Amino acid sequence: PSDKFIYATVKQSSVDIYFRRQVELSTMYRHMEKHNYESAAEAIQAVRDNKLHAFIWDSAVLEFEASQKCDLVTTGELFFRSGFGIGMRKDSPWKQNVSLSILKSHENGFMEDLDKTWVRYQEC
Amino acid sequence: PLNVALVFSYAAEAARLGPAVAAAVRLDVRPVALVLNDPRSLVLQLCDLLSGLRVFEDDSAVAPILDFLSAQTSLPIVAVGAALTPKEKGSTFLQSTEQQLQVIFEVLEEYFVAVTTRAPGHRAFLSYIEVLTDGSLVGWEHRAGEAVLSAQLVSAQIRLLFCAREEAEPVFRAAEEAGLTGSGYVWFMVGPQLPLPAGLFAVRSAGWRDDLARRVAAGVAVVARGAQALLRDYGELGHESLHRYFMNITWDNRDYSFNEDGFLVNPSLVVISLTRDRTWEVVGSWEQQTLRLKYPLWSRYGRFLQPVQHLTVATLEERPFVIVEPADPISGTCIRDSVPCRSQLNRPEKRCCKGFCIDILKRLAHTIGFSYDLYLVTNGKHGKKIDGVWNGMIGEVFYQRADMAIGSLTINEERSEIVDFSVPFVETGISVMVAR
Amino acid sequence: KRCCKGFCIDILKRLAHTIGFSYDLYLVTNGKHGKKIDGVWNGMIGEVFYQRADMAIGSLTINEERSEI
Amino acid sequence: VNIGAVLSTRKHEQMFREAVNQANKRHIQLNATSVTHKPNAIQMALSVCEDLISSQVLVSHPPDHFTPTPVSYTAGFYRIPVLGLTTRMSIYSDKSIHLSFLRTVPPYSHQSSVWFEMMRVYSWNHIILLVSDDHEGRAAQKRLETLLEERESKRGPKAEKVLQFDPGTKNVTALLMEAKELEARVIILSASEDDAATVYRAAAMLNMTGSGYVWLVGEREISGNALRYAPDGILGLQLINGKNESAHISDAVGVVAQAVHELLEKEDPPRGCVGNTNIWKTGPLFKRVLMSSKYADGVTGRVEFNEDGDRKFANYSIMNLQNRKLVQVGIYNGTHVIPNDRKIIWPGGETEKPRGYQMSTRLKIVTIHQEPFVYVKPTLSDGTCKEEFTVNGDPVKKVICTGPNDTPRHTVPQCCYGFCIDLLIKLARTMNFTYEVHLVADGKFGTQERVNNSNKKEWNGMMGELLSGQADMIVAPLTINNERAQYIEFSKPFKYQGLTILVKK
């Protein structure tokens, strides 16, 4: 328990279940519970005013915000691997068709095209 | 209209009471239609009552008969086979098993195999116990006739069973062939009505047996309360659902309000047991979803002694790897990855514990298969040869009070001589601590 | 006899143990992975498509036609 | 012992006398007598008790539901196995309370099972249920649920939208109105005759007439609707044996004679109807020999019965109400239904065959404002969105998202644009279907929460609200994990990331 540092995260979304099922570090999850913040923006501001020291979150979002602001440093190593998907009801041909369309977007090059369209020029 | 067809087929004191017990309960007139007696005679009495004049109790087919008569006459009645059934249509009468299952499952949880022979109640109780058990992380475990029971005895210790009056004794003829009627097992019955087994436990309504006069007075009082509720805003035919006027009754300063289905919402119950001396001792009571009883310690207050193993672990509280914390008030217990620790010397406040020693203890217990209990010593810290007697863990172990003890113990001469220590899993010694 | 091992073998045995299937290992001698030559497919894709192999494992890159079939 | 009967007529009573005499001829002295139904339930209770007292003793219902109850209760006073001929009430089929009563004709639960078989044959996988809040209707829909759930394997029908209904009520057009837009064109009705007529009139005043409006009903309502109002285009069906009092009487006489003959291998009412309440083990003996009775097949057909005395193998007929008359169109036998050699009128009542399904081009999408992925801005003065061509030549496609509440709590329009918005635009252009966009009030992703004061896990946030029903397809920077994965499937991933710490310098 490092009370001098601040270990906070989003209260509900993703790391909640990860640490709940993680089992062995239940005390770490309990500390996160007493340091739970229900906003990415409020966590960013808590980092801003030095009321928060360490904040665990996703990779792309955190690195993009750090590049945009270039007043904070991102040092944690990618200790997790995951992707972002699209969900729908348990009976959907839309699911198969959108999977095919998304893989088509990946193959053609539209994916990194929009990536460089929306991520570039926001880097210090 | 205030007719009380007190049929006893008897109750000489109750028959003689009549208006006297009602006056004790006692506003309009509250007479009694005392009749002592067959269905034809009952029909004649009721037709005479509904023609001229404009609560039944006997030992236990009567329920369908009374339901049909109430439906035909559209007149409320009270049954005191009293509480015995799905409703049919609009008709008023009085008489739960599901509540009994709930309460017994609770009291089992704070302190397995379930079978039966033949009933619709069999499937009803199987469904209800499935609904009760699938949550709260209770833990699923084992979900002529005597020859079959020999074929199983399939390997649990707590046994749940229920039947009518015609299966208990006829099956007990072989004494269930496995000594489960003794202290080595338990038997739980739904109690549909209340050559003889032992170690039996049962549940009953609040009024198990108080008095015939008391119960008839309660029936008269609830009838009068229902009539008064009918008199609200001034709210019988011979040749409806009045239960809507039964939402608030508080006679005898107890929960008396009834449900629209004829059931009493949130009633009071008692849990009793039949000792070897054939005495129906009361284990405890339960009301408003709260139970009171005689305090057990781990499992030995139910007269269970040693299922065919339990370890009486003793340890001392101090702060390196060993840590303690109180049970969470919201849950009433410790965290998910912890162990129930009893900080007692044998009101016991729960104080769970955790640590490296706890981890290794649980790992070895799982890998080798022992049940165990945790004890906290309140006599010294470890133990010394004061006047020959020992305290702490050594004192507990030496006098067989604690079968085995764990914690930070340093193997020595006399301690090895009188303890027989095991392998030194972790290392230590004597060292110095100084500042910079 | 030519036994095999590797990361894919490890994950295969782990999933088989955790889910409980019996299995046998087959080695393909018709191409490397599989391509839409004259409509017919070879390799793992060819084996799977014609029901000769119920399921295939290894280094496979998900594509359009490969996802479709 | 004896046979006995409860019939209000004499001709069928004369046939019963002939049958009992000819049965006693074959190989014991035992007779039988019927009783006319006086215009009172209490009168039947008393008259049946008098018959029991004056004799050493089957029941038939003259065409409602008032006959089987008091006779069964009187039989259960002595716990006597009485049997019925013409009754289909599920309140007696279960016989949990009517343990003295045994059935002889299957109830409407078998009709529901045959409906499931028929809809399984026709390959349809979408079905809605309209059922009255009746215990028999509840048992029927429970039978549907049991038959659907037992299929451990194949996709299978979904069997959703089992909403209830109250008898003798109006304004049902609202519930049917929201049921109309539910992607399924097949419905199953289970209600009384008057309720069926009322709902038929409600559909008539609505647009529930053309294609895509397909349903099948039961015996309890087809006969009632035939009188007064019954529109064409109704599937319907009919019991195989119809109603043949002489045939049923002969079958009952034969089966009871067979039971008596099989009982007399090894083997006397105690005392009439008065002053005796003892047990009668011969009652359970009759039970166990009747469930084991392989009585020779009679006029009705093969005679084999389930545990609660109901004929099995479910032989049935299927009619079709066309041009104000029913036409026999199918015969169901055991497991196979054979349509007749007649032009199967389309179930919709029109000149085109129905698929049983329809498409909804409109989709509902909810999202969370994620700073790098989603940009949300207040709308302009007119509510439109401002235009800016980034830095190079490209217009920023900014959609209107009227989801989020003011934070207040007022659902005000906003302007959304980003990763999810433009990829959704591309996907919609690929699929050529419309859509919408909105935010969520709670601003939570979602988790499995142990509900307070209860013991059930619940879903909140995005997927919780999607399972609620308003949302239809999620587009958000959502990760992938077990519980939500088995609770709802996902598509192929598009953006990849992990977990990382941020800290100041």
Q: What is the DSSP string of D195-211?
A: HHHHHHHHHHHTTTTST
Kindly list the residues from chain D whose CB atom is less than 8 angstroms away from the CB atom of residue B289.
none
Instruction: Quote the CA–CA distance of B192 and B204 in Å, as a whole number.
Output: 9
Q: Any bridge partners for residue B310, and if so which?
A: B371
| Inter-chain residue contact B135 with D455, CB threshold 8 Å | yes
| A105 belongs to an annotated ligand binding site | no
* Contact present, B and D (at least 3 Cβ pairs less than 8 Å): yes
Kindly list the residues from chain C whose CB atom is less than 8 angstroms away from the CB atom of residue A103.
62-64, 67
What tokens appear for D34 in the block? 């019927």
- Nearest residue of chain C to residue A105 (CA atoms): C64
Cα Dmax for chain A: 53
CA angle A33, A36, A40 (to 5 degrees): 150
What tokens appear for B22 in the block? 């009602």
DSSP B176: G
Experimental method: cryo-EM
Which residues sit directly before a break in chain A (C to N > 2.5 Å)? none
Q: Which of B38, B64, B120 sits opposite D275 (nearest CB)?
A: B38
Instruction: Quote the CA–CA distance of A32 and B88 in Å, as a whole number.
Output: 55
Q: Helix, strand, coil shares of chain D as percentages rounded to 5?
A: 30, 15, 55
What tokens appear for B125 in the block? 């109780």
- Nearest residue of chain B to residue D92 (CA atoms): B88
Instruction: Quote the CA–CA distance of D197 and D201 in Å, as a whole number.
Output: 6
* Contact present, D and A (at least 3 Cβ pairs less than 8 Å): yes
What is the CB-side half-sphere exposure of residue B284 using CA atoms within 13 A? 15
What tokens appear for D416 in the block? 């959304």
Report which of D417, D424, D423, D409 is spatially closest to residue D364, judged by C-alpha positions. Answer: D424
Residue C64 contacts A, CB cutoff 8 Å? yes
Q: Which residue has the tokens 């799977």?
A: C48
Cβ atoms of D100 and D82 closer than 8 Å? yes
Residue B247 contacts A, CB cutoff 8 Å? no
| CB burial readout D339-368, b (16+ within 10 A) else e | eeeeeebebbbeeeebebeeeeeebebbbb
Instruction: Quote the CA–CA distance of D291 and D393 in Å, as a whole number.
Output: 84
DSSP D300: S
| Inter-chain residue contact A103 with C68, CB threshold 8 Å | no
| D477 belongs to an annotated ligand binding site | yes
Residue B118 contacts A, CB cutoff 8 Å? no
Provide the sign of the torsion angle of the four alpha carbons A45, A46, A49, A50, taken in this order. Answer: negative
CA dist A55 → A40, B225, B266, B365, D198 (Å) = 10, 64, 49, 39, 62
- Nearest residue of chain A to residue B335 (CA atoms): A26
Instruction: Quote the CA–CA distance of B91 and D134 in Å, as a whole number.
Output: 16
CA dist B395 → B313, B319, B391 (Å) = 13, 21, 4
Do strands D316-318 and D330-333 pair parallel, antiparallel, or not at all (unpaired)? antiparallel
CA dist A42 → A8, A14, A38, A39, D367 (Å) = 11, 17, 8, 5, 19
**Would you call D291 helix, strand, or coil by DSSP?**
helix
Kindly list the residues from chain A whose CB atom is less than 8 angstroms away from the CB atom of residue B335.
26, 30
Phi and psi (nearest 5°) for C23? -155, 160
Cα Dmax for chain D: 109
What is the CB-side half-sphere exposure of residue B121 using CA atoms within 13 A? 22
Q: Any bridge partners for residue D247, and if so which?
A: none
**What subunits touch chain D, counting only 3 or more CB pairs under 8 A?**
A, B
Q: Reported resolution in A?
A: 5.1
Instruction: Quote the CA–CA distance of B90 and B85 in Å, as a whole number.
Output: 14
Q: What does the CA dihedral D449, D450, D451, D454 come to, rounded to 10 degrees?
A: 160
Instruction: Quote the CA–CA distance of A74 and A86 in Å, as a whole number.
Output: 28
| D269 belongs to an annotated ligand binding site | no
D179, burial (CB in 10 Å: exposed 0-12, middle 13-18, buried 19+): middle
